[PDB]
Amino acid sequence: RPATWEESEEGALSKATKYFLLAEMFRGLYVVLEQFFRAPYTIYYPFEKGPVSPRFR
Amino acid sequence: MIINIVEILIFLVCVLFSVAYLTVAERKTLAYMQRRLGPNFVGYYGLLQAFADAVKLLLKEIVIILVISPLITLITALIGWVVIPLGPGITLGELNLGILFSLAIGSLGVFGSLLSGWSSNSKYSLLGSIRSTAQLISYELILTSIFIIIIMFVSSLNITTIIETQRVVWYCIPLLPLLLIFFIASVAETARPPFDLTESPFVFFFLAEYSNIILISAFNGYLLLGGYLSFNYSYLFNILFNDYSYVSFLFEGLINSSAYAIKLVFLMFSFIWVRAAFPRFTYDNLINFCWIILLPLLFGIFLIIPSTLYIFDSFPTL
Amino acid sequence: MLILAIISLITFVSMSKLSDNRAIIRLINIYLILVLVLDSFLYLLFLNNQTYTVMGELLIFNSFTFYIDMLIYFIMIVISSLYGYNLYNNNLYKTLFEPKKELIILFLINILGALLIVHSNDFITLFVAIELQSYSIYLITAIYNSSYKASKASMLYFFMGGILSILIAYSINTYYSVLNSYTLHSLDSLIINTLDLNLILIALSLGLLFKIGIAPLHKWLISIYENTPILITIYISLIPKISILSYLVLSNISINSLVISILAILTLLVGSVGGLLQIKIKRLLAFSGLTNAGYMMLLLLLNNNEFSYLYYITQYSISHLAIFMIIIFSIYYINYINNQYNPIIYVNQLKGLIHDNAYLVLSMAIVVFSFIGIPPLLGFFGKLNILMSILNNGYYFISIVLIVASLISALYYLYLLNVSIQDKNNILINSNETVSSVLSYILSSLIILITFGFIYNSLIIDIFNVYFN
Amino acid sequence: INANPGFWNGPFRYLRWSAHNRPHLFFAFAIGIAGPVAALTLTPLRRKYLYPDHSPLPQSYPLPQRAREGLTGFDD
Amino acid sequence: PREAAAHWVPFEDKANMPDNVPDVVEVGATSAPLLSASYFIGAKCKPYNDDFMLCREESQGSGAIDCLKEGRRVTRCAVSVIEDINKSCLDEFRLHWQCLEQNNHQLSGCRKAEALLNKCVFTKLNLEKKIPGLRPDEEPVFLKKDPWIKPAVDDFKSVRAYAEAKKNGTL
Amino acid sequence: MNTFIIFIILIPIVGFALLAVNILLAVYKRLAFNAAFILVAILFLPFDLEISTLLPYVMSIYLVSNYGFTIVLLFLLILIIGFVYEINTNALKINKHNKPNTDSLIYK
Amino acid sequence: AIPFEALLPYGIIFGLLTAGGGAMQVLHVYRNGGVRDRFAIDQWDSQMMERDLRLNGGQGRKQVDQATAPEAFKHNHVWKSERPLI
Amino acid sequence: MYLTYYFIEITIFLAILCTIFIISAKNPMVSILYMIALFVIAAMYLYLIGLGIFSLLYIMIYIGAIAVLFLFIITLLDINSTELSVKSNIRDLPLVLISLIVLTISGLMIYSNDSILINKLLEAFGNDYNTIITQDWFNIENTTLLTTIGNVLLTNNAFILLVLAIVLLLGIIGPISITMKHK
Amino acid sequence: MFIGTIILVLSFLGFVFNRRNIILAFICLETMLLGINLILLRNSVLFDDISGSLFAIVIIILAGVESAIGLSLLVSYYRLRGVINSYGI
Numbered sequence A: 001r002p003a004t005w006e007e008s009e010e011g012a013l014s015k016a017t018k019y020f021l022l023a024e025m026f027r028g029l030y031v032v033l034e035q036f037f038r039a040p041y042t043i044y045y046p047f048e049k050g051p052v053s054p055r056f057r
Numbered sequence B: 001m002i003i004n005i006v007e008i009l010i011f012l013v014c015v016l017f018s019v020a021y022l023t024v025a026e027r028k029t030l031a032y033m034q035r036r037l038g039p040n041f042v043g044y045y046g047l048l049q050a051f052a053d054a055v056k057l058l059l060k061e062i063v064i065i066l067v068i069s070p071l072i073t074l075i076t077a078l079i080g081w082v083v084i085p086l087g088p089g090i091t092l093g094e095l096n097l098g099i100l101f102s103l104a105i106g107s108l109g110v111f112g113s114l115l116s117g118w119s120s121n122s123k124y125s126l127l128g129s130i131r132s133t134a135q136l137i138s139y140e141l142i143l144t145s146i147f148i149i150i151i152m153f154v155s156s157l158n159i160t161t162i163i164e165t166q167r168v169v170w171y172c173i174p175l176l177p178l179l180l181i182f183f184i185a186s187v188a189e190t191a192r193p194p195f196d197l198t199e200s201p202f203v204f205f206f207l208a209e210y211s212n213i214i215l216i217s218a219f220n221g222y223l224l225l226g227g228y229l230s231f232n233y234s235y236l237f238n239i240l241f242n243d244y245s246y247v248s249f250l251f252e253g254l255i256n257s258s259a260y261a262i263k264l265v266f267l268m269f270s271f272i273w274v275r276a277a278f279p280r281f282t283y284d285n286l287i288n289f290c291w292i293i294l295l296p297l298l299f300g301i302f303l304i305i306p307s308t309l310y311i312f313d314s315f316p317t318l
Numbered sequence C: 001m002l003i004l005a006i007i008s009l010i011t012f013v014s015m016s017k018l019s020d021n022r023a024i025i026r027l028i029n030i031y032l033i034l035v036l037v038l039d040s041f042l043y044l045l046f047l048n049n050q051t052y053t054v055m056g057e058l059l060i061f062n063s064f065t066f067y068i069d070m071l072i073y074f075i076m077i078v079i080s081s082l083y084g085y086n087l088y089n090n091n092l093y094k095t096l097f098e099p100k101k102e103l104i105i106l107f108l109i110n111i112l113g114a115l116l117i118v119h120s121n122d123f124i125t126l127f128v129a130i131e132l133q134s135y136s137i138y139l140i141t142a143i144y145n146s147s148y149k150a151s152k153a154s155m156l157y158f159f160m161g162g163i164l165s166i167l168i169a170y171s172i173n174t175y176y177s178v179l180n181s182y183t184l185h186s187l188d189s190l191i192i193n194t195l196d197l198n199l200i201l202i203a204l205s206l207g208l209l210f211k212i213g214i215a216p217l218h219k220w221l222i223s224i225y226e227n228t229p230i231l232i233t234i235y236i237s238l239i240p241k242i243s244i245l246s247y248l249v250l251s252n253i254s255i256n257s258l259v260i261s262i263l264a265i266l267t268l269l270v271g272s273v274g275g276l277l278q279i280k281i282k283r284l285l286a287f288s289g290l291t292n293a294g295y296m297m298l299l300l301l302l303n304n305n306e307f308s309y310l311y312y313i314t315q316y317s318i319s320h321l322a323i324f325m326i327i328i329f330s331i332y333y334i335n336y337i338n339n340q341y342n343p344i345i346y347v348n349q350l351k352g353l354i355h356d357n358a359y360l361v362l363s364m365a366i367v368v369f370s371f372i373g374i375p376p377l378l379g380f381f382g383k384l385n386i387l388m389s390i391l392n393n394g395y396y397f398i399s400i401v402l403i404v405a406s407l408i409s410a411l412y413y414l415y416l417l418n419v420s421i422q423d424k425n426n427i428l429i430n431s432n433e434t435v436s437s438v439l440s441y442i443l444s445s446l447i448i449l450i451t452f453g454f455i456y457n458s459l460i461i462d463i464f465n466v467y468f469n
Numbered sequence D: 001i002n003a004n005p006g007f008w009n010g011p012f013r014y015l016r017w018s019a020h021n022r023p024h025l026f027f028a029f030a031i032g033i034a035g036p037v038a039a040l041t042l043t044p045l046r047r048k049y050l051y052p053d054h055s056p057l058p059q060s061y062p063l064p065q066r067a068r069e070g071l072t073g074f075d076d
Numbered sequence E: 001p002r003e004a005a006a007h008w009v010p011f012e013d014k015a016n017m018p019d020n021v022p023d024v025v026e027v028g029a030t031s032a033p034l035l036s037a038s039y040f041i042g043a044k045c046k047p048y049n050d051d052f053m054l055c056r057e058e059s060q061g062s063g064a065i066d067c068l069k070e071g072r073r074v075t076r077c078a079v080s081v082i083e084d085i086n087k088s089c090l091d092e093f094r095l096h097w098q099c100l101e102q103n104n105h106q107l108s109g110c111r112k113a114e115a116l117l118n119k120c121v122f123t124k125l126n127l128e129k130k131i132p133g134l135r136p137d138e139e140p141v142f143l144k145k146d147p148w149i150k151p152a153v154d155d156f157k158s159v160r161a162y163a164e165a166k167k168n169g170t171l
Numbered sequence F: 001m002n003t004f005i006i007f008i009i010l011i012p013i014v015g016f017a018l019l020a021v022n023i024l025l026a027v028y029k030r031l032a033f034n035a036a037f038i039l040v041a042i043l044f045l046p047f048d049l050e051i052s053t054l055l056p057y058v059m060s061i062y063l064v065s066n067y068g069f070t071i072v073l074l075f076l077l078i079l080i081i082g083f084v085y086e087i088n089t090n091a092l093k094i095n096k097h098n099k100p101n102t103d104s105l106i107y108k
Numbered sequence G: 001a002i003p004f005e006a007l008l009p010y011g012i013i014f015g016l017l018t019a020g021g022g023a024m025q026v027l028h029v030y031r032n033g034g035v036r037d038r039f040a041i042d043q044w045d046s047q048m049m050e051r052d053l054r055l056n057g058g059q060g061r062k063q064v065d066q067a068t069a070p071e072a073f074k075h076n077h078v079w080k081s082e083r084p085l086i
Numbered sequence H: 001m002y003l004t005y006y007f008i009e010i011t012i013f014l015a016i017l018c019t020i021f022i023i024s025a026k027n028p029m030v031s032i033l034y035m036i037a038l039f040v041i042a043a044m045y046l047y048l049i050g051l052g053i054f055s056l057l058y059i060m061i062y063i064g065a066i067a068v069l070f071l072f073i074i075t076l077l078d079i080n081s082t083e084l085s086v087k088s089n090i091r092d093l094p095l096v097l098i099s100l101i102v103l104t105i106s107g108l109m110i111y112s113n114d115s116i117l118i119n120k121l122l123e124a125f126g127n128d129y130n131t132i133i134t135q136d137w138f139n140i141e142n143t144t145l146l147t148t149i150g151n152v153l154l155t156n157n158a159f160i161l162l163v164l165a166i167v168l169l170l171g172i173i174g175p176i177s178i179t180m181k182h183k
Numbered sequence I: 001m002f003i004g005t006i007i008l009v010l011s012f013l014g015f016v017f018n019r020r021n022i023i024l025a026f027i028c029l030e031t032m033l034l035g036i037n038l039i040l041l042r043n044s045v046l047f048d049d050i051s052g053s054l055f056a057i058v059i060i061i062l063a064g065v066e067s068a069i070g071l072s073l074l075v076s077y078y079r080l081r082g083v084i085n086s087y088g089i
């Protein structure tokens, strides 16, 4: 059976701190900010061609 | 005469520039959020993007009212720039009822959303324009109600009076939940995409959009965060300068505008930063979020503030 | 203790279901009864026409106003004892006369709006309270939304009440422009001589008066009364009349008024000759409302009209209330039922009612003789005491036209009896189910007041003498 | 599923229920009730124990209620 | 008692005070000096100011025409105080209102030249600042140490003069 | 001629210029709704308009000490019961028919 | 590490508002003759600033100081006429 | 400088013009667009007279809420409307030409207190006289207009704010009384 | 008093002499309240008091709640019908 409100391990105040202060919103905000500070994947086309095989057609 | 026309020249030209460089800043930072180069560059040549696509945007097709709503949307977005102060007592027009004006123009800004749906009408497109209008007014409520609970500590409708009151402590640090809910109500006035069902002559809506972006950033910056205030800086000057001179007033106006622009720039970056990370809302979720859950908290914060001013002496004098 | 009721019940009705509405109205009924029983010792506050100004020159509490303040709760108990209680326990009588969820809220908001006029001193309490009660009539009318006539009626009443509200606000603004104060006692009998005020004070009067049915503009109200359902209209015909008429009578701003005397005559003419050739019962009944609300601009012309007014208002409210409750009883015996909201529409429909039961026609006969001023009834002394004041203060042609109006009006009061005592051909021999006990005891009590109020006439005059002089 | 127990079928259990399942109406009504209830219980404790109330500001020029004793000086 | 118009048109009147009101020595001080010397002309000329507002009270509506005698004497004694503060402490008075001409004439921003001026005037001219209506066990606000409300820029000349008054020991 | 008024004269000129350059450079050439949509705007007005009843208190909060406090508290506490009316009655929620009503399969 | 091309737009926006506000404070100090502006102006303060304009002679807030008034100070006092406001 | 004199009579003429464009328009939205023009001509007059606070309150609630309300209604509703044709509206002209004269002259009558009925009207126009504005130095704090409204609504007229609560209460209950259809 | 009387009289005759739609009635009713305000506020200014402004700030609110109520009355009228008629209710 899915557990009710009263068979929950955390308090209602502890749950409301996650509810009002957007606990996992800032986590996903932090992930995209981590991606802001690393070196991108992008390549110049008319002056560099991507990696190819000998069996290419 | 010449004394003030050069002054409004400098201000209009600076704000007109800054709104255009935001259209480049958003493309760049969302490029590096997703590991692309994005636009090639950002310099003095860097406006020639936003210039060039602002030119080419005037080359497509459109299919008396259609003339008026982009116009009134842009002039409503542009007249609200006087009333922000940029330094102590520096306004383009000084008025004791600046928040009442700022509030009346946040009220005037809704009309272009109505009159845009009339042009090239369908049944379903008209309904969609209705939905964008109703979310715009719905979050305008909580905007206005928190303006009240900020000026409860000031008890004055002047804006430099707010910031000079704010000198001892910013209003953001006691009322931190208020900062959080204002930031989301601030990306709610605008159509920023956590809050953008109802999107997903055009040059005026395009310009006035970013002008509203940076202008509600200004409205955050003076009343919640410190407006032009960074620190006390009384001690550094007594070592640098010997007496008041035009160099000294230049240096202080410079550091005050720097402290204002850093607030506005970090907040403006956070708008584009909250754009990328989240998907958008169902409209029922939008209205439900505005009314049923957030606004009872708003009545509660509204009752808990005067009672806290009541428990101590602490009523603010005009 | 209205707002102690309203604030409580609005939270109580917000959470209760649609089936609970009857028992909610029963609770509010018993609450109003005990507010009248346990708190009616406040008559002792005045003993020599002592008047209090409360909330700082804003409300005015005297004894005329205490009597109207008690009268409105009493009639509201009789009205709320209708929606609380079933008429019969049948399928028809459940699908007829259904109370909406928000109806019991809007009644008490209207009583707040009606009480804050009779108690009112300032013009701003006047304006806010006419607005509160005008909204409540806009929404008591429109709450039966799934009715074509009721929605058209609420939309008409909206714009006509809006014009007369702006006319009142213009008069209030104009009196403010010629004199700095808002209160009516800034007049204090030295202004009016040295100041042309006649045009302002009449336009303030005529603004409220046209909201009630003063007869150049009588055509819209008759249409609203005929179009609403038959239970909204007993309330929205009683309440705004008595509330503003006791305002305009408490504060005698138009004495010797020629405009008021003309429109009084025009009311007594067109009401008594308008009701003559009319086949719908709520029509006939609303022009009986019109002539009787035009024995009112008469007392409004007078000075010192507080025996004639108060006696005639409680006369009229009991008589009004009783005859609507008679035709609400009469709908069971009729052969044809149309129009679920408004079940009896024609006065042709209540034929042969004496062969169905005789005592409901005995009741109907005493009320219809009380409207036409038949002397052993309580409705007689109302016209007697109007005429002991009309002639007292010099209105002689008014008295003759009053008499002729009463005689022309009796011609369409007696049509109710001419219809109701006739042969029907299909008599009732046995009804299986009987009408609700308390809801017929209320009508029996309202009869015996009408037929036996001359007993206590003399006590009332002595009591009156003490407590208003 | 979590259903309504009722405020009348145990108050404290109902407040514990509403704190978990409807925190947008518990912690909104409980932050707004902590104002007018704390204004009736925490103010005399302050006026006795922390500091008493302030002296009122003047609003107009403060006229005394004397009868002009005759001043001497600054004649010409 | 009223705020000006749509289109108000200013005018003056080249005329004279007619016959019987003598000539007077009116205050030619601007907002900064008389805002600076406000407590001292309030401390010396208390009963004359009191007497003028009392006389204006007792002649209700007569008013302006009635106490020409006596608004003559509040001007004379206020001019007396400010001539005395000129000849007494022109340098430190000037320091205080050259401070107070910035900072919106907020009194909050100029404690430093203020306390120097108050020592100078209490020494030579023996008048003292009081905030009346202030019950005891309430510190007056221009005496407290580490206030919450500090100015933006302490002006330079009063920093120097206050430091030299510390070094001399007169403060 | 102050510096406030050139700005709100000069901006409609800027808009007219950005509009006339658009007219110079461009190419040219009932369904039923739900009650919640109408109700959001109809009901928005009595909640926008108590805010402006709240605007004169917030300026004069010092003068009405201890007394205008309680008047404003009672004003707001009368408004909260109409708020709890609309949130008890589920007024803004829009509903649909996606449930199969979850009736158990009854045989014979 | 940090991207410089991402931060140059915000650097330009920051520098634009910075140079704007510095120019603004210098223009205000040049108009007033070396003193900062009055941001909150009472009715009292407005009447007082008009009296200062009347006292010092022509210039805005010169803030002169004298033991007495000049003889022209008695006669230059103005009353404001005002249209009918129909 | 006396270009800056006729500013009130200008806005009076503009209000006349603007109501002529209210009651003569093709679309139902064109009429409310000239209506928000009328609100802003009014707010210019209210600033002009000496009331800067009100003009912005009129912008906040009259081209604020109730504008958006009416624009909104005219969007999501269909409303048939005819044009101002001469064949359906010239029949009203000899009543309008009487009622204009009578209602304007009578609305300019009650500002006077004589008893001649021609000296009553001629006191409405015989006012070209310039009020003289003195400076009194009695006021010490900037109690502007909004402070005094907040002092009078809250102490002297607290009951009007407290009945006003019931009116706004009713403005919330009413649309839910009607437009819901519970169950 | 000219601008208020003119808005009141002309808005009144715009109310009275329509036969084309229902919304011109609403907006002429709203501009009548504006016309009453334009007279009241100038009598507040010229007499030097707030009490006409007191009645002004009250009648702003009553015009607001009036519009809220009356447009819910119109949606009642429109729900049951199909299309609001040209000639009127």
Ligand SMILES: CCCCC/C=C\C/C=C\CCCCCCCC(=O)O[C@H](COC(=O)CCCCCCCCCCCCCCC)COP(=O)([O-])OCC[N+](C)(C)C
Binding pocket: C036, C037, C040, C041, C043, C067, C074, C306, C307, C310, C311, C314, C315, C378, C449, C452, C453, C454, C456, C457, C460, C463, C464, C467
């Ligand atoms: C035990 C209760 C059981 C439940 C009953 C619930 C409601 C009963 C409601 C009404 C019953 C009738 C009471 C009438 C009181 C009149 C007071 C009065 O004549 O008013 C006079 C002045 O009137 C007037 O100007 C003229 C009014 C003319 C009335 C015309 C009709 C009267 C004929 C029948 C009425 C009398 C019948 C008596 C039946 C035994 C003021 O005196 P007052 O204000 O001090 O009287 C109230 C004192 N009190 C509250 C303690 C009772």
Ligand SMILES: CCCCCCCCCCCCCCCCCC(=O)OC[C@H](COP(=O)(O)OCCN)OC(=O)CCCCCCCCCCCCCCCCC
Binding pocket: A016, A017, A019, A020, A021, A022, A025, B177, B178, B180, B181, B183, B184, B194, B270, B274, B285, B289, B293, B294, B297, D024, D027, D031
């Ligand atoms: C002190 C005593 C009381 C203690 C508690 C503290 C109360 C004070 C705090 C008040 C501040 C409240 C902030 C806003 C509350 C948001 C409510 C919420 O997040 O959840 C409710 C709502 C969904 O409603 P529901 O049906 O209940 O969903 C259940 C799912 N858990 O969720 C939603 O509909 C949307 C959820 C996302 C909201 C939009 C997100 C905007 C993204 C911005 C995030 C912040 C970005 C910051 C950027 C700069 C950071 C450096």
